[PDB]
Amino acid sequence: QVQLVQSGAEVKKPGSSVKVSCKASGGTFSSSAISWVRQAPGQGLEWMGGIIPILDITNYAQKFQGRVTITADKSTSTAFMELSSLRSEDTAVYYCALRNQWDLLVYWGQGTLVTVSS
Amino acid sequence: EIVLTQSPGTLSLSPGERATLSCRASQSVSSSYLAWYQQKPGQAPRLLIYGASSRATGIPDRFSGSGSGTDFTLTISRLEPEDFAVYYCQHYGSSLWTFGQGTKLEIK
Amino acid sequence: IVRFPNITNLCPFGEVFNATRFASVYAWNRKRISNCVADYSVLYNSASFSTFKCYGVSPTKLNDLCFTNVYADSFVIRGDEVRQIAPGQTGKIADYNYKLPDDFTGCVIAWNSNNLDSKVGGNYNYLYRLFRKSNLKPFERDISTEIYQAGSTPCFNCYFPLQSYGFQPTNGVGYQPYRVVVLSFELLHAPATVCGPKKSTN
Ligand SMILES: *[C@@H]1O[C@H](CO[C@@H]2O[C@@H](C)[C@@H](O)[C@@H](O)[C@@H]2O)[C@@H](O[C@@H]2O[C@H](CO)[C@@H](O)[C@H](O)[C@H]2NC(C)=O)[C@H](O)[C@H]1NC(C)=O
Ligand SMILES: *[C@@H]1O[C@H](CO)[C@@H](O)[C@H](O)[C@H]1NC(C)=O
């Protein structure tokens, strides 16, 4: 019954910051890992990083160390990613994905485009 | 690290025939963490295969995954008109995800 | 207070429970779980299991515990054979394929797998041992291919010890296949490594 729900976005200037939320439903927020994946136009997918809320462990992909913050707030069954100091090379679709333990199946949300421009 | 490479980058196929996609890892992985996905332009990835072989709910039995070690594959038995899409493999172990570029399965 | 080990991982149970292929009963598959966190509430609360019986522990207390080791033994049996996977039981599986010690700590979990394991013409990849000269000791795997007797002669007779089952959609419930996972625990006198989801403090 797992579902991931994401918000929309727009940024008016490079150097600014976007924070995107992913609300989880269907229960089992705990005992799961949440990852963020980006898809730039014309590209394939890349992993940015991810978090395990009950261990409160965050692991970032190396190219995204700096600028990217991944956090979570289990009290509202949600997770966030924030990308600061945007450079317009990053006007990609951002997806959240979740996997529970006791399973193998990966659930995906509806990726949200973050467009950054004058 | 774990780098998946797909082959061929592109396919040119008749609707109605059989075709396969290859995915090759740089280092061996557990089969339990491999998945195949597809996209149509403008859409979120659709899961087809997980655990390197289980079929995802809602996926027709045209799609069959298999493999081990570094060598994995996805077979589509008939290539129906709806099956022409960009496909790709993913390794989803807990420490690092990797996505395999992708292959474009064209009709022509 | 709550003062559990500084564990940085979630337990890899998906591989145990959500696998496409399960071992046959005479060649059951054991896996070890260690140095991880698991929330047992979720699995327990799921309504998918037909059987969930614990020995020495209660399901509701599992999250407050931490174990030395956890071993997961998985295999396929018929529905009517579920009765035998328990301490104190006898029968062709309890005696020839999968023996539990009678003094047992852990949980036995099982569910109907007709949708995955039965095949239209019969899934004959699942075999059971019918012939053995003596009973098994706890946790033995008899994977031999030796041949058994009938009359008082050397090797009418020469029975192949294993029998495949016709797991087919045509079966009534007692003949549908079931997937069984047994979680065996080691605990207390130990530097325990498999812990529940507790908020360790101070
Ligand atoms: C792999 O797991 C999926 C998901 O199963 C759910 O989560 C489990 C932890 C457990 O609580 C299950 O009972 C839950 O359903 C399985 O997909 C489900 O399969 C059943 C048929 O048996 C179907 O009725 C459900 O709708 C499916 N749910 C979803 C979300 O797809 C899948 O069958 C498992 N695969 C294997 C090989 O075991
Ligand atoms: C790890 O956990 C044990 C539990 O008894 C504790 O003694 C030890 O100090 C902990 N290590 C750290 C770095 O906190």
Residue numbers in the entry:
A (entry chain H): 1 to 52, 52A, 53 to 82, 82A, 82B, 82C, 83 to 100, 100A, ...
B (entry chain L): 1 to 27, 27A, 28 to 107
C (entry chain A): 326 to 480, 486 to 532
Study text:
In each complex, we used a stabilized, uncleaved Spike trimer (HPM7) based on the Wuhan strain containing 6 proline (hexaproline or HP) mutations (Hsieh et al., 2020) and an engineered interprotomer disulfide (mut7 or M7) between residues 705 and 883 of the S2 subunit.
CC6.33 binds a non-overlapping epitope to that of CC6.30, with the HC and LC interface centered on the N343 glycan. HCDR3 W98 reaches into an aromatic pocket lined with RBD residues F338, F342, A363, Y365 and L368, while also donating a hydrogen bond to the backbone carbonyl of D364. Fewer hydrogen bonds are predicted between RBD and CC6.33 compared to CC6.30. Lastly, the light chain is mostly involved via LCDR2 packing against and providing hydrogen bonds to the viral N343 glycan, and a single peptide-peptide hydrogen bond between the side chains of LCDR1 Y32 and RBD E340. The only Omicron mutation immediately within the CC6.33 epitope is G339D that may introduce a clash with the CC6.33 HCDR3 backbone. Omicron also contains mutations S371L, S373P and S375F that could alter the conformation of an adjacent loop and prevent the N343 glycan from adopting the conformation observed in the CC6.33 bound structure.
